[PDB]
Amino acid sequence: SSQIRQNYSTEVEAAVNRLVNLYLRASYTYLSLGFYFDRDDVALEGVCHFFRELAEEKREGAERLLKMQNQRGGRALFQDLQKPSQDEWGTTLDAMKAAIVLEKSLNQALLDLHALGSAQADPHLCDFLESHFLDEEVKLIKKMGDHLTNIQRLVGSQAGLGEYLFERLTLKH
């Protein structure tokens, strides 16, 4: 048992374990999205790389949460990772909408955990979130919003042409 734990409620410990699960699950979802865009009959490499990079970022988020849990003398508990919600992700637009939906749910979970730590007078937790998650998430959501607007602008009359141009001219590949 921990000899270090101090000011670290059971409620926060549990919610941290839940948030780890949410991040690993987001990572899995992004792995599925990335490989869908690598299919021969989809073949949008920039979209593929964007989601693969997100899978790695979400995994790193979970790892940092796990490190913190141990730093505080909490105990990591893992649950099943639920499979992603779809086997096929539709167009780049459907996918980017899905990604924003997912990020908004992770953001609300961060905000909920922050409100918990504030209620429990756990400033270390609040600052950990502030310093490594809250702004990173706002920045990512703004970027997705930006992309979504550009994707939408491009559907207009010839969706295929728009979808190709977005991937070629905005996304990194």
Question: Interface with Ru ion by CB under 5 A: which residues?
Answer: 123, 126
Residue 49 makes contact with a second copy by CB under 8 A: no
The answer for residues whose C-beta is within 8 angstroms of residue 60's C-beta and 6 or more apart is none
Q: Please report how many Cα atoms fall inside a 13 Å half-sphere around the Cα of residue 50, on the Cβ side.
A: 19
Question: Burial, 57: exposed, middle or buried (Cβ in 10 Å; 0-12, 13-18, 19+)?
Answer: middle
Residue 98 makes contact with a second copy by CB under 8 A: no
* Residue of 72, 54, 59 whose CA lies nearest to 25: 59
Residue 36 makes contact with a second copy by CB under 8 A: yes
Residue 123 makes contact with a second copy by CB under 8 A: yes
Binding residues: 53, 56-57, 60, 63
CB of 117 to a second copy, least distance (A): 10
Q: Which is nearer to Ru ion, 123 or 145 (CB)?
A: 123
Residue 11 makes contact with a second copy by CB under 8 A: no
The answer for residues whose C-beta is within 8 angstroms of residue 156's C-beta and 6 or more apart is 162
- Name the 3-class secondary structure at 137: helix
Q: Which is nearer to Ru ion, 20 or 126 (CB)?
A: 126
Site for a second copy in 131-150 (CB under 8 A): 131, 134-135, 138-139, 141-142, 144-150
Binding residues for Fe cation: 53, 56-57, 60, 63
Chosen from Ru ion, a second copy, none, partner binding at 170 (C-beta under 5 to 8 Å by type)? a second copy
Question: Burial, 23: exposed, middle or buried (Cβ in 10 Å; 0-12, 13-18, 19+)?
Answer: buried
